[PDB]
């Protein structure tokens, strides 16, 4: 994580960033949340206090990358996020708090919309006829909630 | 509420059957209560092909895309209504269409080939646009229809082409060995048959 943090300073100003770097970062986070997720959680926490709408875009990109990576979601990262203590004073001094909740709600609402398809409607019509399906994402979400 | 309104309009039309199709036209104009329209055309049919085939084919394959989406949503929603039982008019009209399938099945007649073609295109519209999933009996009678031998006319060529395209598109409806041997023997007959000059074999080869 230290090397990534050190290179982030140079990468922020550089315009050579491409989707390959984001895909590699998402794959690394999904495969190993031991080091990268620890800093990523703090980075996402800091992004929720900004005035610009940057949490929604990052969440949408992460969801798109995860969907393209065949549901590359780390189950052990949830325990690190729950055990992580937001004890910093900069986060507690942020005046705008409802904005983060609104952004999270919008991200959740837009992430569920990725399953909308006319073929998903035909599978929903096939449920009590052909084959009961179009519900794996919901089941996975229930497991994550558990 | 919708069921009671539909039943009330059904009784009103039973009391004045001359205006039943006018009420069905009002239904397709105002673009709600599709079950009422289906039930009215069913009570009206209760020679041509049928008012049912014309009505639902025009609904699913007309220029108006709003009507197409509306009736497709109707078909999808009705399909989930217990997956059986005469409670929904969807299964009533499905049985009526299946009865028509029995009616035109036999060597296919010269007079029934065009009706078979229209019925087959209607079934294509249903299972393709409307998302209908056929039952085992529906699939069986469909396969019985496709594998028929029309009497080598341009209508026969069109019918064979449409049936072949249905098999290529909705190949999930075979799902059995005896229907597999039926369709391969039908394909072999189709290969042997080359007097269709008076564009089917080109499609098969392609």
Chain A environment of B131 (Cβ under 8 Å): 121-122, 125-126
Alpha carbon of B86: minimum distance to chain A alpha carbons (Å): 15
Check if A128 contacts B (Cβ < 8 Å): yes
Number of neighbouring beta carbons within 10 Å of residue A58 = 17
Determine, for residues A128 and B80 on separate chains, whether the beta-carbon distance falls below 8 Å.
yes
Tell me how close the Cα of A101 comes to any Cα of chain B, in angstroms.
Answer: 35
DSSP symbols for A33-83: -SSHHHHHHHHHHHHTTSSS--HHHHHHHHHHHHHHTTS---STHHHHHHH
A120 in contact with chain B, both atoms CB, cutoff 8 A: no
Report yes or no: A77 and A37 within 8 Å, Cβ to Cβ: yes
Contact between chains at A126 and B82 (C-beta distance less than 8 A): no
For every residue of B54-95, which 3-state class applies, written as one string? HHHHHHHHCCCHHHHHHHHHHHHHHHCCCCCCCCCHHHHHHH
Report the gap between the CA of A81 and the closest CA in chain B (Å): 41
Q: Which residues, at least 6 apart from B5, have a Cβ–Cβ distance to it below 8 Å? A: B33
Block residue for tokens 């035109």 = B104
Q: Cβ of A125 and B76 within 8 Å?
A: yes
Token reading at A44: 């996402």
Is A125's CB within 8 Å of B83's CB?
no
Give how far A96 is from chain B: nearest CA, Å. Answer: 43
A120: closest chain B residue by CA: B131
CB-CB neighbors (< 8 A) of A128 in chain B: 79-80, 82-83
Residues of B in contact with A127 (CB under 8 A): 80
Cβ-contact B115, B104 below 8 angstroms: yes
Contact B131 A122 (CB under 8 A): yes
Residue with tokens 């391969």, as numbered in its chain: B184
Q: B77 to chain A: which residues are within 8 Å by CB?
A: 125
**Count of CB pairs separated by less than 8 Å, A with B:** 29
Instruction: Give the dihedral sign, CA B165/B169/B171/B172.
Output: negative
Q: Do the beta carbons of residue B87 and residue B81 sit within 8 Å?
A: yes
* Both tokens assigned to A115: 């399953």
Residue B60 near residue B126 (C-beta atoms within 8 A): yes
**C-alpha closest to that of B64 among B28, B116, B17, B11:** B28
Tell me which chain A residues have a C-beta less than 8 angstroms from the C-beta of B79: 125-126, 128-129
User: Is there a contact between B133 and A124 if contact means CB atoms under 8 Å apart?
Assistant: no
Distance between CA atoms of B191 and A125, rounded to whole angstroms?
A: 37
Hey, are the CB atoms on A122 and B76 less than 8 Å from each other? Answer: yes
Q: Which two tokens stand for residue A71?
A: 């549901």
List the Cα angle B191/B192/B197 in 5-degree steps: 85
> What is the C-alpha separation between B202 and A43, in angstroms, rounded?
63
B63 vs chain A: nearest CA distance in angstroms?
A: 20
């Amino acid at each position: 994580l230290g090397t990534t943090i050190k290179l982030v300073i140079f990468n922020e100003l550089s315009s050579a960033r491409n989707p390959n770097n984001m895909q590699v970062l998402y794959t690394a986070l999904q495969h190993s949340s031991e080091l990268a997720p620890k800093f990523l959680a703090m980075v996402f926490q800091d992004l929720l206090t900004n005035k610009d709408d940057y949490l929604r875009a990052s969440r949408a990109l992460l969801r798109e990358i995860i969907k393209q990576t065949k549901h590359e979601i780390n189950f052990q990262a949830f325990c690190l996020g729950l055990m992580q203590e937001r004890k910093e004073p900069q986060y507690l001094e942020m005046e705008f708090k409802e904005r983060f909740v609104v952004h999270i709600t919008d991200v959740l609402a837009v992430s569920m919309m990725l399953g909308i398809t006319a073929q998903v409607k035909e599978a929903g019509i096939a449920w009590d006829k052909g084959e009961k399906r179009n519900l794996e994402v919901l089941r996975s979400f229930q497991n994550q909630i558990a | 509420g919708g069921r009671r309104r539909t039943d009330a309009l059904r009784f009103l039309c039973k009391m004045n059957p001359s205006q039943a199709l006018k009420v069905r036209g009002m239904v397709v104009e105002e673009c709600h209560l599709p079950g009422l329209g289906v039930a009215l055309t069913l009570d009206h049919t209760k020679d041509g092909v049928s008012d049912l085939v014309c009505f639902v084919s025009g609904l699913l394959l007309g220029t108006n895309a709003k009507v197409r989406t509306w009736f497709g949503t109707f078909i999808r929603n009705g399909q989930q209504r217990k997956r059986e039982t005469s409670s929904s008019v969807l299964w009533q009209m499905r049985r009526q269409l299946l009865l028509e399938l029995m009616g035109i099945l036999p060597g296919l007649k010269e007079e029934h080939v065009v009706k078979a073609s229209a019925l087959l295109r209607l079934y294509c519209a249903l299972m393709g646009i409307a998302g209908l999933k056929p039952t085992e009996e529906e699939a069986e009678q469909l396969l019985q229809l496709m594998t028929s031998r029309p009497p080598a006319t341009p209508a026969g060529v069109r019918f064979v082409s449409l049936s072949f395209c249905m098999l290529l598109a909705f190949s999930t409806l075979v799902s059995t060995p005896e229907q597999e041997q039926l369709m391969v023997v039908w394909l072999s007959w189709m290969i042997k048959e080359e007097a269709y000059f008076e564009s089917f074999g080109e499609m098969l080869l392609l």
